[PDB]
Scaffold this active site. Structure first.
Site, mmCIF file in Angstrom:
data_model
loop_
_atom_site.group_PDB
_atom_site.id
_atom_site.type_symbol
_atom_site.label_atom_id
_atom_site.label_comp_id
_atom_site.label_asym_id
_atom_site.label_seq_id
_atom_site.Cartn_x
_atom_site.Cartn_y
_atom_site.Cartn_z
ATOM 1 N N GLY A 54 -7.856 -2.161 9.981
ATOM 2 C CA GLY A 54 -7.914 -0.916 8.535
ATOM 3 C C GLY A 54 -9.216 -1.127 7.671
ATOM 4 C CD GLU A 100 -8.209 -2.599 0.613
ATOM 5 O OE1 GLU A 100 -8.987 -2.018 0.261
ATOM 6 O OE2 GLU A 100 -7.660 -3.457 0.571
ATOM 7 C CG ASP A 147 -4.199 6.368 7.548
ATOM 8 O OD1 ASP A 147 -4.793 6.938 7.641
ATOM 9 O OD2 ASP A 147 -4.045 5.266 7.745
#
Ligand SMILES: Nc1cccc2c1C(=O)N([C@@H]1CCC(=O)NC1=O)C2=O
Lengths: 233, 177
Positions: free
Chosen positions: A29, A31, A149
């Site tokens: 991803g 992070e 998300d």
């Protein structure tokens, strides 16, 4: 002399980095990194956010803790509500690492849609998938869980693939809210993912909205907010 | 060459967890007292509410983790393993419902060895007035109705996975409620 508590915490973070060092990456991803491994005889994935290099160490730890805690809480809420999502095995708050069930042999909804569109050239055959996603996200929102998300990359299809066994993943940006606006923004992120990642699949998203509206008694104000947030871009 | 079940902890490779299962126990009251006096090694656990050894290994992994950090919720490693089995954070309730009492006739003993810490297993087994059995016999000792009772496992949880998986989810996340 160093504090024994701080020394113990450093030893635990070393254990975690060492465990992750030799593992295969399954997802990257912004992070987070997700690795696959074994946890006490079970296939597991381990999710961790590594310091990016340009930020204060304390800020990185606060970020990792916040998202790890939110994801663990969401996955519990999912399981108790019968929303299919990975089992949590262990959450290491010393290192902010999340150990959870690997959804073995699964494909992302993103990959499944793209493969279907490249074989069939028509989205007509994706209607059942859209209806299932509508039912799943209706149940999630009816538990007031905002995913945060919602893209077709954060939904897995567990084999056998054509049973359309949807499994939700990656709840690090999730939170709890009953507000139609928050649910509306959730659906808007998903709409944009369909539009930009799966062009010429508007019928697919339309069928999703139809099934969502059928499945949730609270969908009407959510779909009104979805219209509004699209305009107030 | 024995009925013990042992596993290394993946995250603490120097630790080995051992499980020993006993039926027809006649001195459970003495055993409970010895554990409180520190004269018997390990966690004495009620197997009637243990669905699978994975449930024990998850609880043991967490107990060792917090032991080494010095951040256990309870007094000792052996109490911590038992506490971790419970779905909630009431320590006294956990130790009473997942521990053993004088009117139990089946006992599971769980202990952890690491480094210089070695358990005399033959002596331990000799302390139990009962018959050691292989862990293959756990399904006939575990009581599914009592498990669903202690865990408040629900119909929607069972629709999407095993009882074990719902139990593990409760155990692994109860520290952030
Ligand atoms: N980000 C998460 C979060 C939770 C679980 C998983 C993931 C994840 O990427 N996978 C892939 C899916 C494809 C597969 O076969 N194995 C995996 O490891 C997961 O099971």
């Amino acid at each position: 002399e160093p504090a024994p508590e701080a020394e113990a915490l450093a030893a635990a973070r070393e254990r975690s980095s060492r465990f992750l060092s030799g593992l295969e990456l399954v997802k990257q991803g912004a992070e987070a990194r997700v690795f696959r491994g074994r946890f006490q005889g079970r296939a597991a994935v381990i999710k961790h956010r590594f310091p990016k290099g340009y930020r204060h160490p304390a800020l990185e730890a606060r970020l990792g803790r916040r998202r790890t805690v939110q994801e663990a809480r969401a996955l519990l809420r999912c399981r108790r509500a019968g929303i299919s999502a990975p089992v949590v095995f262990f959450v290491d708050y010393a290192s902010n690492c999340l150990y959870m069930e690997e959804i073995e042999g699964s494909v992302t909804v993103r990959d499944y849609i793209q493969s279907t569109m490249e074989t069939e050239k028509t989205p007509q055959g994706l209607s059942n998938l859209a209806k299932t996603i509508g039912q799943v996200l209706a149940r999630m929102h009816d538990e007031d869980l905002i995913h945060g998300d919602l893209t077709t990359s954060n939904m897995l299809l567990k084999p056998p693939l054509e049973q359309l066994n949807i499994v939700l993943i990656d709840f690090g940006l999730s939170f709890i809210s009953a507000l139609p606006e928050d649910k509306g923004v959730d659906l808007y992120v998903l709409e944009k993912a369909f539009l930009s990642t799966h062009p010429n699949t508007e019928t697919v998203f339309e069928a999703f909205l139809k099934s969502y509206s059928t499945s949730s008694k609270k969908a009407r104000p959510v779909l009104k907010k979805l219209d509004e947030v699209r305009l107030r871009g | 060459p024995h009925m013990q079940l042992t596993h290394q902890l993946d995250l603490f490779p120097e630790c080995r967890v051992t499980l020993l299962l006993f039926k027809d126990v006649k001195n459970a009251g003495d055993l409970r007292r010895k554990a409180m006096e520190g004269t018997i090694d390990g966690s004495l656990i009620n197997p009637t509410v243990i669905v699978d050894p994975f449930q024990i290994l998850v609880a043991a992994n967490k107990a060792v983790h917090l032991y080494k950090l010095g951040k256990m919720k309870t007094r000792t490693l052996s109490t911590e393993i038992i506490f971790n089995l419970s779905p909630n954070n009431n320590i006294s309730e956990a130790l009473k419902k997942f521990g053993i009492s004088a009117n139990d006739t089946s006992i599971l003993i769980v202990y952890i060895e690491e480094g210089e810490k070695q358990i005399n297993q033959e002596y331990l087994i000799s302390q139990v007035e009962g018959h050691q059995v292989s862990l293959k016999n756990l399904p006939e000792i575990m009581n599914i109705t009592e498990v669903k009772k202690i865990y408040k496992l629900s119909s929607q949880e069972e629709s999407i996975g095993t009882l074990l998986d719902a139990i593990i989810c409760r155990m692994s996340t109860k520290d952030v409620l």
